[PDB]
Nucleic acid binder design. Structure first.
Lengths: 111, 99, 80, 97, 72, 96, 109, 98, 83
DNA sequence: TCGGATGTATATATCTGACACGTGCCTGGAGACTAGGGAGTAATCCCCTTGGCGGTTAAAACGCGGGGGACAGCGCGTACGTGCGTTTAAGCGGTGCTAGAGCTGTCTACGACCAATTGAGCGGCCTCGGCACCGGGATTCTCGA
DNA sequence: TCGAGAATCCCGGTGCCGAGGCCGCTCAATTGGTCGTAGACAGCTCTAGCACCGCTTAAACGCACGTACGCGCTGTCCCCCGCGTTTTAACCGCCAAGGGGATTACTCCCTAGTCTCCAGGCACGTGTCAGATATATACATCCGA
């Protein structure tokens, strides 16, 4: 009767996001009567993938401007320049973001 | 003779300068006072957290900038360069906001 | 209390310049002021309703985010 | 002095960032924005899954509902990659014990 | 030098290697002392995927370094 | 070999219509449209009430949540009249 | 012994089922517990809205010398009122149609 | 000698006539064939209920009518009577679609 | 049976009738192709969503409820067909 | 500015298919009782909001010269509206047939719930390096001749 | 076409404050075990979706003709733009006071759950009349002399 050493559920799935916290939030969120044993793994994997994509693009954009930290402008530049992510966050405004540097062609000086 | 630029160059310079950066554009105190006056009607003796005022300012600025972009497109469609109130009205009507 | 006049003409000019406008007519300012007033009235009404239901006296930053999210205008970075 | 504990996804976001870019920092505002983004996506997916389960008069949420909701919300390429990642994670969790 | 390679099960093995030694030499020694085929060895040190064409000095893998191994 | 029971709102809609206009009928498609309208409105109000209750760290929904959700959803005159009607109905039910 | 049963709608003086609304609220996965006052409020609000729309539609139909109500009458009633149009701004009604308006420029001189 | 109306009268007549009625405008069978051909690309050997096709037709008709109204407004704004593709493009761009 | 080239079934007079109901008085000669493309895109999106919905239920026949749900999910809900 | 020709509105018979209504019944709602935790109320602490005063300095406000842009008027020719004869396939009415939606048993694997416990995650402190700021020079633009 | 002024960028030096990391500990995720039912699979029944064939006629198609509208071009007048001078209030720093938000403990009562019983809402079947068609006639409107 010796209990085995504890292993986090995220460790078995080879993930980084917490499986147990997601499971608790699903159970306490008033979504359904009962929750299966596989949904938290799927949700954690999806969230991790999306976070990794966003962070990679933002880091590339920050490295472009010779900076070692990420600020909201870098996140805005990363999001707005990818059509897929721009379509995802269509109706979301980011604080301290700014706009893309574009100008209409006709307004340019003649000659 | 004093050195003067032709009309239009400074406008493009201002466009580049203000669209490169990411600061706010409206003075804080007048906006806070306006928010307080508007909210006074709905309920008397209210109080505000500063972050709420900041959020309201950010949202208003974003909305106005997007509206101005759409208005500029509407103006350009009709073979012009200067925006006019009818352009704002048409953009608001098409967007579905104005009844 | 004519505090709507605090939105000076150079401020509207700066906003339009960031938007990408090169020439501005002399009657834009009244329309801009009216539009901003309407938007602020709607958002503040919703936020005050939320605060009243919460049974408090000072509006928080959270119910502003909630009111904005209700109108399909989600905002990021303010404790949402 | 008594302080209530607040929960956030800050540590996991930092772990992912250090996994992708070995040498790059992040400020507090960016962390707050990422926390909000994660919460928003979680809420959308969970609500879609709940409605989808309720349509077919069932009482349980399983991986199939999550997969269908993900395929419904995300566009093409993102949906494909997310589906592959979720399937791989679930298989790895099941095979091990 | 001596380096540490930690497997997926929580076991750390010691490799008597050199900075000039390529990652393929590390894989060969790991196979010799544990039986893990080099093609099934996935290696990270300092956040960099280890490539057989590169050496241990390329990844700044020095003595008493900690390396992570996956057999998946 | 009979079919299963399908619940609907036809009887109550017909009762209200006969209360308002005593000499006017209604076709099938209009009844279906009205049924869809009733279901839609019910869903919106219930969802808003649930979110409001979750926001303030509560585990029940009472008349206050419904009243606030009604005030949030409907425009001005409709909100005022509906609030008055709901309050009057609740008071009359409690009194009996 | 036992006393005779009286429906809760009769007690509240309504025409919509209070018990059915209570059951739908309980089984709809909205909250852990449901109070005893929400169904009455919900039923009253729904009854008010239904009565308003039905009155407007009946008026519109009677303007067209008909005894029954068809979807065109509902569309005309909804689109010709301000608040009702605002409430249903993103809803399409089958077999509805449109409102008879023409821009003034296209009219002949 | 033959009686011919001036250009424009018949257009207004049809405008009034088709704004007074409520029946469908597109034919049924070609629309059903189009729906089946489009759906063939996602899953083969599919079957449809008639009410589904009717609902799809109703929704598409309403969408097209609204789009044409917005296009007419855009065309009128620029001192013109005839609608052109750039009007449709501008309306779609402003509406928030890609 | 595999069917090809049914987009041309939307004849020019049908588009003209739709425009007339919309309030248009004069029509250019290049509108029809643009209208056909727009309609094709719209149908593609709606049909994709409905097919996904009917796939989740392990069925082989698309029902009206799937179309209604797919239309609602895009914020253009439809009344008069159930639900 | 009149008058002929065309399309639309108005009045009457008539025949059919959908609406309104009467039954049977069976499942869902109502009456009576218990028990147990969620929510209302009182008391306390201290943190954050509001208010006032001085300076200082950058931004707001006002006036003027002028050049480019909005707008009206004119001419042309070309694409689109209207009408007629010809060709095509949509629409309606039957008749067959079977794939698949829908309902009933059953039986087992999976999720909820409970007690002990122990390692992950959050609050507090600090330390030092990345980024902000100022001064200077090289560079890249624009406008008059 | 070419050169004289302004605005912008790259480089170097200096200083500050917040981001990354370490400790301590308390509450939530793990582990082991029991029990009840949600749903997966098999079987059967009946409907409605697919296919074919014939006929009728309304709608789509192609062609000819004329005209009105889209578009380029020119001239005028005036109204925003760039620049200089004067005025003001925003902003930063500091100092005081207190109202209302955030916890903590205690207690009554409001709702979930169970059993028993009966009546209201739904599926089914039927009659009849509101309105959709067909026919004829009166009236409003458009375009040429």
């Amino acid at each position: 009767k010796t209990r085995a050493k504890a292993k986090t559920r995220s460790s078995r799935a080879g993930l980084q996001f917490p499986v147990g916290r997601v499971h608790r939030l699903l159970r306490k969120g008033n979504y359904a009567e009962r929750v299966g044993a596989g949904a938290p793994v799927y949700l954690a994997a999806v969230l991790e993938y999306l976070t990794a994509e966003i962070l990679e693009l933002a880091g590339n954009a920050a490295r472009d401007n010779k900076k070692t930290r990420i600020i909201p402008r870098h996140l805005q530049l990363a999001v707005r320049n990818d059509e897929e992510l721009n379509k995802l966050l269509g109706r979301v405004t980011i604080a301290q973001g700014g706009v893309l540097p574009n100008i209409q062609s006709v307004l340019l000086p003649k000659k | 003779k004093p050195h003067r630029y032709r009309p239009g160059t400074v406008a493009l310079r201002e466009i580049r300068r203000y669209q490169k950066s990411t600061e706010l554009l409206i003075r804080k105190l007048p906006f806070q006072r306006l928010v307080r006056e508007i909210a006074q009607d709905f309920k008397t003796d209210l109080r505000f957290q500063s972050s709420a005022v900041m959020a309201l300012q950010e949202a208003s600025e974003a909305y106005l900038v997007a509206l101005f972009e759409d208005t500029n497109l509407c103006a350009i469609h009709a073979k012009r360069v200067t925006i006019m109130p009818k352009d704002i009205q048409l953009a608001r009507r098409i967007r579905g906001e104005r009844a | 209390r004519d505090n709507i006049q605090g939105i000076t003409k150079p401020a509207i000019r700066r906003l339009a310049r960031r938007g990408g406008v090169k020439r501005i007519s002399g009657l834009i300012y009244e329309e801009t002021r009216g539009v901003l007033k309407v938007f602020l009235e709607n958002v503040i009404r919703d936020a005050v309703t939320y605060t009243e239901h919460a049974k408090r006296k000072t509006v928080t930053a959270m119910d502003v985010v909630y009111a904005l999210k209700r109108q399909g205008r989600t905002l990021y970075g303010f404790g949402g | 002095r008594r302080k209530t504990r607040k929960e956030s996804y800050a540590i996991y976001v930092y772990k992912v960032l250090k996994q992708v870019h070995p040498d790059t920092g992040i400020s507090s505002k960016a962390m707050s924005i990422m926390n909000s983004f994660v919460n928003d996506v979680f809420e959308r997916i969970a609500g879609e899954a709940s409605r989808l389960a309720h349509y077919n008069k069932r009482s349980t949420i399983t991986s199939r509902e999550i997969q269908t909701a993900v395929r419904l919300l995300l566009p093409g390429e993102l949906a494909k990659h997310a589906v592959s990642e979720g399937t791989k994670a679930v298989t790895c969790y099941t095979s091990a014990k | 030098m001596q380096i540490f390679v930690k497997t997926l099960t929580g076991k750390t093995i010691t490799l008597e290697v050199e900075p000039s030694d390529t990652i393929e030499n590390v894989k060969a020694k790991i196979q010799d002392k544990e039986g893990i085929p080099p093609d099934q060895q996935r290696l990270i040190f300092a956040g960099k995927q280890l490539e057989d064409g590169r050496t241990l000095s390329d990844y700044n893998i020095q003595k008493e370094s900690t390396l992570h191994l996956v057999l998946r």
